[PDB]
Nucleic acid binder design. Structure first.
Ligand SMILES: [Mn+2]
Ligand code: NA
Length: 191
DNA sequence: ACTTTAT
DNA sequence: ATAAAGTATAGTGTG
């Protein structure tokens, strides 16, 4: 099974949507009977939004006096998953451990303090986690500084190997992969 | 490498 | 006027 790890840039715009969905505040493949089974791995406050959480965090810690730019990348949302088969082999304890382990890799490489949320969805087709990493470093907020072409290449080699080192049996994706990413809607048509 | 942004 | 950070990026799956 391949390690699936992919990030999306999140602004003020789409963080409201991310928050209202990630909390189950519908889609055909959501089983509402199972939504009570989702869980959150950070110890964030359920009732505070992501925008409000991150904006306060950055402002309260940033070296510069200047305002966060309207078009700033407030966080990079990483989807952490694999395929059906992969999870089929694991029980509840181990599935939880898998996501905590991935969360760790991101804590250790980019700061435990920058994991805004870590939201595990067991009510869709395949267990996955929506994990918000705030690109904040040296008192500066910059996705550009933190996740560049090389960092993404690096993660594709390094994350899967770090997972396997903790007893999880997944291989890295195809190097120089030709694939274009499809949005979830696009990918459903494809099957 | 070039534009937008907030100074 | 200046300069940091905006633009994608790397990967596979029904996020
Ligand atoms: Mn989900
Ligand atoms: Na220009």
């Amino acid at each position: 099974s391949y390690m699936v790890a992919r990030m999306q840039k999140m602004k003020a715009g789409n963080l409201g949507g991310a928050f209202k969905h990630n909390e189950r505040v519908s889609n055909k493949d959501i089983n509402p009977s199972r939504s009570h089974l989702n869980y959150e791995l950070t110890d964030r406050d359920r009732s505070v939004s992501y925008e409000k959480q991150i904006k306060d965090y950055v402002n309260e810690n940033k070296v510069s006096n200047r305002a966060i730019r309207k078009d700033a990348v407030l966080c990079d949302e990483w989807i952490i998953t694999s395929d059906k088969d992969f999870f089929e082999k694991l029980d509840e304890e181990q599935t939880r451990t898998f996501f905590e382990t991935a969360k760790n890799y991101f804590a250790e490489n980019y700061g435990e303090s920058n994991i805004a949320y870590a939201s595990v969805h067991l009510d869709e087709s395949t267990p996955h986690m929506h994990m918000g990493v705030v690109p904040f470093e040296n008192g500066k907020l910059s996705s550009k500084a933190m996740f560049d072409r090389e960092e993404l290449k690096h993660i594709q080699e390094d994350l899967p190997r770090y997972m396997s080192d903790h007893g999880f049996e997944l291989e890295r994706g195809k190097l120089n992969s030709e694939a274009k990413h499809k949005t979830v809607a696009e990918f459903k048509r494809a099957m």
